[PDB]
Amino acid sequence: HMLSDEQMQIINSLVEAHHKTYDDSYSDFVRFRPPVRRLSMLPHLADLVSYSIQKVIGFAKMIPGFRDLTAEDQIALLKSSAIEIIMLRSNQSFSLEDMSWSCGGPDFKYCINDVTKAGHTLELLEPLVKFQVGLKKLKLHEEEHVLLMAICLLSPDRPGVQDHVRIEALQDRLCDVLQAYIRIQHPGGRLLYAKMIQKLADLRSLNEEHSKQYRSLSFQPEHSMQLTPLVLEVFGSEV
Amino acid sequence: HMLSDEQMQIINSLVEAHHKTYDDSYSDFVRFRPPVRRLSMLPHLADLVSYSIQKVIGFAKMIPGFRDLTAEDQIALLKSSAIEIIMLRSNQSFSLEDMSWSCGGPDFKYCINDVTKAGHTLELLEPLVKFQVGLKKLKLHEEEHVLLMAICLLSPDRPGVQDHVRIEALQDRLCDVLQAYIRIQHPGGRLLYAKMIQKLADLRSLNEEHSKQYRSLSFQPEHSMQLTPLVLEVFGSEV
Amino acid sequence: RHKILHRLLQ
Amino acid sequence: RHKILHRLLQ
């Protein structure tokens, strides 16, 4: 057996959307408030995350079917999955040699400690690094990585989603595209699909922990003032 | 005649508050989103203005009497005068040689054109530069400049102020301190006080124009997203 | 509300 | 409201 034209077009559109919304040089990082090493890394990391939300929105808008959902479902899906898509996309900068995200030079090399200086704890950072190491070891094809992000985004089990039948259908269409890609194009991927679906479960708990820690930060006006309007809106409680 | 102990203590406290909230080296400017020359200067200038609001709050809290007003009057006074205090304090960086604010190097030298790239027009920038030139020519003593800022801050004629009798009294106490300072300590200041009070009238119209232009910017989410939580709150319409 | 997100989604 | 301003005024 082989992939159909429709399945192939889905892969093409997703890979192109990722190439359009992810810069491997990290050249836009010089435009953020600079890194500093009380929560010295918060301005830089808030700017980094704000920039990445914009990219995730860019990517999302090109996922086949996403543009057809209501502005409400689009927002509900973006709000609840943004941090998970940010965690997935960050894997491309993660290095197993130094257990860090390497984004250009000495300034943009981020370790656990730097994120601690952004108001985060090891209750989040220890499983994040473990998730990063695990996902990195899966040696995903660009097609699988892009499909995993789109699958994550289109999870119907999110607070605020209204049309859980239409989102579940788009997600299943994407899950079949992934399953077939691994079967046809990935030699030795016999257990990959399962391992990948298990990574989405990991993201849910990482998401829960981030939200808790973010709520703490967002409630202290001296820290919330260092965030951006986009971060506040996306990670905020408004309906 | 001469200044009294009380009048002298007011001058001492104000000069000290300004020395504590104004850096002549402009060394904190490297921590802002960098200058870029669609509204390329907005991130840098929003960060600059956000930083300056913080300083104006710092200064305000040390103006004798201000701390005794209700949190409501303190907010109402800060909200409506912030841009005027920013305009006054910026005079210390204004240069008559190049008609610009020189804050360190080639990156932090700001001309009319740069502010145009922050969503502002010559309807604001032409009278601003004319105001800057005029105030600069007054060759104010540090004591007069600090008194002018405090006088501006304590203007009772502001939207939202409740105790206009207590604010008017603090402002008059400050106006007498200024009048006496010029009389005793400023040789040739016979017409200075009037010229200074006239600069406050200028600030009202400059404030009105800035608010109009800012409302335009704040209504476009692509521009409002580049502002900071502090700028949005201070220049915002909430009561 | 969600003013920014609405704009960014066009 | 004015959460930031209130904090900054202590």
Ligand SMILES: C=C1/C(=C\C=C(/CC)c2cccc(CCCCCC(C)(C)O)c2)C[C@@H](O)C[C@@H]1O
């Ligand atoms: C964000 C990206 C990169 C690194 C990511 C990283 C590591 C720096 C990270 C990712 C997700 C979550 C976290 C921890 C929370 C960040 C702080 C966000 C707030 C809103 C303050 O809670 C770190 C770097 C590049 O791979 C681009 C990618 O989009």
Ligand SMILES: C=C1/C(=C\C=C(/CC)c2cccc(CCCCCC(C)(C)O)c2)C[C@@H](O)C[C@@H]1O
């Ligand atoms: C702000 C300061 C300095 C320069 C000031 C300057 C000239 C750069 C300026 C001042 C007031 C108003 C304006 C124009 C409006 C700025 C943009 C603000 C928003 C909220 C986007 O409308 C420029 C530089 C230093 O003197 C410190 C001082 O506090």
